[PDB]
Design a protein around this ligand. Structure first.
Ligand SMILES: Nc1ncnc2c1ncn2[C@@H]1O[C@H](COP(=O)(O)OP(=O)(O)O)[C@@H](O)[C@H]1O
Ligand SMILES: Nc1ncnc2c1ncn2[C@@H]1O[C@H](COP(=O)(O)OP(=O)(O)O)[C@@H](O)[C@H]1O
Ligand SMILES: Nc1ncnc2c1ncn2[C@@H]1O[C@H](COP(=O)(O)OP(=O)(O)O)[C@@H](O)[C@H]1O
Lengths: 590, 563
């Protein structure tokens, strides 16, 4: 015969043998039918073939010749157990749904399974006899109280409670979802049902109560000195923004990311940018072989990377695939080109909590802290606005028009996550402190409402990789609990350093995002280019037949106006936000 | 309870509900046992969950309390039939192997099935020597007089007829040829249309498309498809399927402007109208980005990138209706099988597994080793008639590669020498241009073969690579092709069979897998070294290449030298 290992490559789409028997037992009306039906449905919605033995298929086929007097009752269970073991042998999750009141009959069913190395999960669907009588789902209790059913178990027979059930379901204190979840978690604990890849936040910080230990432990390890952009990726990871990574990407994750823009093990997860740690040939030969090493920023041990692996940093290829150009003078590519030729993946345990002592640590909320913030505000929708530039009223418009659309849909407490990036940025961008003072100003003028707006800083470095990057911007906000992701023209783009043309076609980030896999809990809210409209004296959506009506105001014109001592047109930006920028531009010329 | 249709979607890996019972009956123990065991292996080898009820799992279990009384035996057969019913209900092919001598009982078993709307196939294993021969069995297996595999084939054919086993569950090929009954009208209509001249590489991609290798594209990629392809290596709309290379048509600004607005236009190659492209859309090429994402470099001297860089700034997608059957009239057309002709070929040869070997170079015995070991692997896993699709690429190749005609002559010599077995090998030309994009292109090599019905796809070292024209180092990391392919999405109906690098073992005098400890037992002979050796009138070591095949290459290199 074909082995269990091989029958399981072909039973279902999920690999690996998982035949077993989930043996429900309890009083008439305790919940067995209802649990097995909901379990079966879960299993089938998750790709795991199963089959249920119950009163409707056993009693009138195989067991039709069995009456009620007690040797028949014993034989009934025995036959059910033998059939179930056969189903389990065949690679199915067999669910059985019979009162099965006697301990001896159920231990026998367990032993027929265990003697054949098939898992047997005895699930006691436990509700008091009075409750099951109350329910009297099929009117059998009312018919027993007045004769003409037998030793109806609970009344004229006994029900013998299992002594060591794999699970007890207290159906008078829990709901059907509680039941199904408790059973599914059992089956996951026991490797019958796999744990799919998830976006549920996963911090890589060691628990506070394990901290001091981990620090001591970190002291005994060899060490690798990291730089500030790295430390900032250490924070992206620590806080969960790259959930479910367990650390810097291993080879297999890096290659998935570069070719498919997704992690694929255990389900499709969007992750389009490498999150890697680099190393020179010298650091590799030093650390290669150790099972753990510490990462050291500004002479402090900030994280431990366990079970590391070293693989090549094929830099030209990485760059080409991530940015769609290998141009040496792209400012993030320039840094990648100066890194080592090795990458290191492993499981990252981050130690002290990351704080930059710079005056802005109050805005650097983790995804958990943000989710908590959204619930504390009782939002029923969260829209996110990634950005790296001062907010002008073209951005504000996209935020204002999304807030509108969510009102018109029915939401009654939309919250805006105004989410500037604070990780590394290229030289000629507006420094983070400036931009935050600038958005504070925009909020003080009420262009965005401070009572419905959370302002926090996204710790990722900025890569300037367009349609590749904007998936990362988007997914990061989905992790933090955004339900809606606002995207306009050329997101994450910049001019090509050699040609001066746009590196990326401006509609690409949005088109790509609207069809990118793994972006399941959010909706993409895309917008056309907005620009100062000179006729209507406000920011508006650009229109082609009407070219003369619109002023495009670049970071470069603004810097010019600020020197000349002038102002952009009224309604381009909030006057106090402008003032912040004049103060910015003043220090810049020095 | 979840319905049959829904249980049918999760039970196995092929989709469609196919619960039924194959009820063997007859005296011969070995006949029943050999048939059930082999049918079981076949079903599992082909992705169909099944389960056998026989003495070894019923007698001492479910029926352990039944003996030989006429009543016990009847009950014995009743219980097995009800259980079989439950497996068939669960979506499995249930095979039961019991003498079941009595018409009454077999007939009852059938009614338990037929009354629950489950197919029941009574198979009389008839091997003459109060058994009651079935009056109208679905099948008669003469097991004493036909071998096991023909018997199993008989059952499998019956299951195909009755829609349990798929006649064919490769990905359905979508040709883009206009059907032979509409061609004349379609060529007349093409005559009325504007025209866009295309070159020969284009006309090869027209062929890729026509013949269905890029299923489910309906023609040259529209923007959406191009973006999915470059970012995700897959088409996504209505299902994820692997497609990692752009399949596109380029155009100049001048041709875009002439043609933008037209709802259809003809493609013209050597003065002939070869295709119509309908409802075209024009979008920006973006050559540097395309090149970077597709090849992992923008190096201007990579020989396909160099062609992409001389094409126009526009791409044109649309619905492609290919007219005349593409034929090249160079003497190799007999090998240019479409995916539909290949599937039919594999049927005619009664394959029960197809292993594909993509290549673009002369076959040496390292390549052969991969094929031979694959063939071993398939036999060991239960396949009885594995067929090798030897599938040289025949579209554009770079300047110093061995020309296609010489390669086909070389491979005919390899098969003439028995290094691969001509009787279990189909030799056909894959019509794609070769891009030399390594791990990106290897997915395209693999998906193309999937559409042609390959069940297993062999991949080795540095598939689809080449030296970086600047450094001469490998453009791609040499393990990446395999690693990426083994995990690539959208290639669900075949299996990847990856191999480590093979090389000439001096000690053993044969091609073998390389070993780091043993570095110096291994000679690596490149195409370069082959050419040098020919020029000085030497041969490679014995066992590296079939002799007749080497001789073809000397003829090739000789014709170079005349040049
Ligand atoms: N958490 C629970 N799990 C299962 N059933 C529950 C639960 N809470 C209430 N019930 C109800 O209890 C009754 C159980 O009936 P049923 O499943 O047929 O019991 P059994 O099959 O054990 O005779 C149903 O009406 C069901 O909705
Ligand atoms: N003026 C514009 N009109 C429409 N959308 C815009 C405009 N300017 C910026 N956007 C969009 O607003 C956000 C702009 O943020 P911006 O700070 O430059 O940084 P980035 O796009 O790098 O994240 C993105 O969604 C981007 O597409
Ligand atoms: N010496 C070798 N050892 C192992 N695999 C090899 C070897 N040479 C080539 N291969 C593999 O053999 C197949 C054919 O190689 P080749 O004809 O050179 O073309 P390409 O790899 O472009 O398809 C590919 O799977 C390739 O990885």
């Amino acid at each position: 015969h074909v082995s269990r290992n091989k029958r399981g490559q072909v039973v279902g789409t999920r690999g690996g043998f998982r035949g077993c028997t989930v043996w429900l037992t309890g009083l008439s009306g305790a919940g067995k039918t209802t649990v097995s039906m909901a379990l079966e449905e879960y299993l089938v919605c998750h790709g795991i073939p199963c089959y249920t033995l119950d009163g409707d298929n056993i009693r009138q086929g195989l067991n039709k010749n069995l009456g009620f007097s007690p040797e028949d009752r014993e034989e009934n269970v025995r036959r059910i157990a033998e059939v179930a073991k056969l189903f389990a042998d065949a690679g199915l999750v067999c669910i059985t749904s019979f009162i099965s009141p006697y301990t001896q009959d159920r231990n026998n069913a367990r032993q027929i399974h265990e003697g054949a190395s098939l898992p047997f999960f005895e699930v006691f669907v436990d509700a008091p006899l009075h409750v099951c009588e109350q329910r009297d789902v099929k009117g059998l209790y009312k018919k027993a109280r007045a004769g003409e059913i037998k030793g109806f178990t609970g009344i004229d027979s006994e029900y013998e409670k299992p002594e060591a059930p794999e699970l007890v379901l207290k159906t008078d204190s829990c709901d059907v979802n509680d039941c199904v979840q408790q059973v599914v978690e059992l089956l996951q604990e026991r490797d019958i049902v796999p744990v799919d890849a998830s976006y549920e936040v996963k911090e890589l910080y060691v628990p506070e109560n394990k901290l001091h230990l981990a620090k001591t432990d970190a002291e005994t390890l060899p060490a690798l000195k990291i730089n500030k952009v790295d430390m900032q990726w250490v924070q992206v990871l620590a806080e969960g923004w790259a959930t479910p990574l367990n650390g810097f990407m291993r080879e297999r994750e890096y290659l998935q990311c570069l070719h498919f823009d997704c992690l694929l093990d255990g389900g499709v997860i969007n992750l389009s940018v490498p999150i890697v740690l680099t190393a020179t040939h010298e650091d590799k030969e030093r650390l290669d072989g150790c099972t753990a090493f510490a990462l050291m920023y500004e002479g402090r041990r900030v994280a431990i990377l366990r079970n590391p692996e070293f693989f090549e940093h094929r830099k030209e290829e990485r760059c080409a695939r991530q940015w769609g150009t290998t141009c040496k003078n792209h400012p993030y590519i320039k840094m990648v080109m100066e890194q080592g030729d090795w990458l290191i993946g492993g499981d990252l345990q981050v130690l002290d909590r990351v704080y930059w002592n710079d005056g802005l640590d109050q805005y650097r909320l983790t995804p958990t802290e943000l989710k908590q913030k959204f619930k504390d505000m009782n939002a029923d929708a969260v829209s996110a606005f990634q950005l790296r530039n001062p907010v002008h009223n073209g951005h504000a418009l996209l935020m204002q028009d999304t807030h509108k659309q969510l009102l018109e849909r029915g939401y009654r407490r939309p919250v805006l996550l105004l989410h500037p990036l604070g990780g590394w940025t290229k030289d000629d961008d507006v420094p983070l402190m400036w931009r935050m003072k600038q958005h504070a100003a925009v909020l003080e003028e009420g262009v965005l409402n401070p009572e419905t707006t959370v302002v926090a800083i996204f710790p990722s470095p900025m890569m300037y990789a367009g349609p590749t990057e904007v998936q990362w911007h988007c997914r990061a906000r989905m992790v933090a609990g955004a339900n809606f992701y606002i995207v306009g023209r050329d997101p994450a783009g910049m001019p090509h350093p050699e040609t001066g043309k746009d590196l990326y076609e401006p509609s690409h980030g949005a088109k790509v995002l609207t069809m990118a896999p793994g972006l399941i809990t959010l909706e993409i809210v895309p917008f056309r280019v907005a620009a100062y409209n000179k006729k209507k004296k406000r920011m508006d959506y650009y229109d082609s037949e009407h070219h003369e009506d619109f002023e495009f105001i670049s970071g470069t014109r603004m810097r010019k106006l600020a020197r000349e001592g002038q102002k952009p047109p009224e309604g381009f930006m909030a006057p106090k936000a402008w003032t912040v920028l004049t103060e910015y531009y003043k220090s810049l010329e020095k």
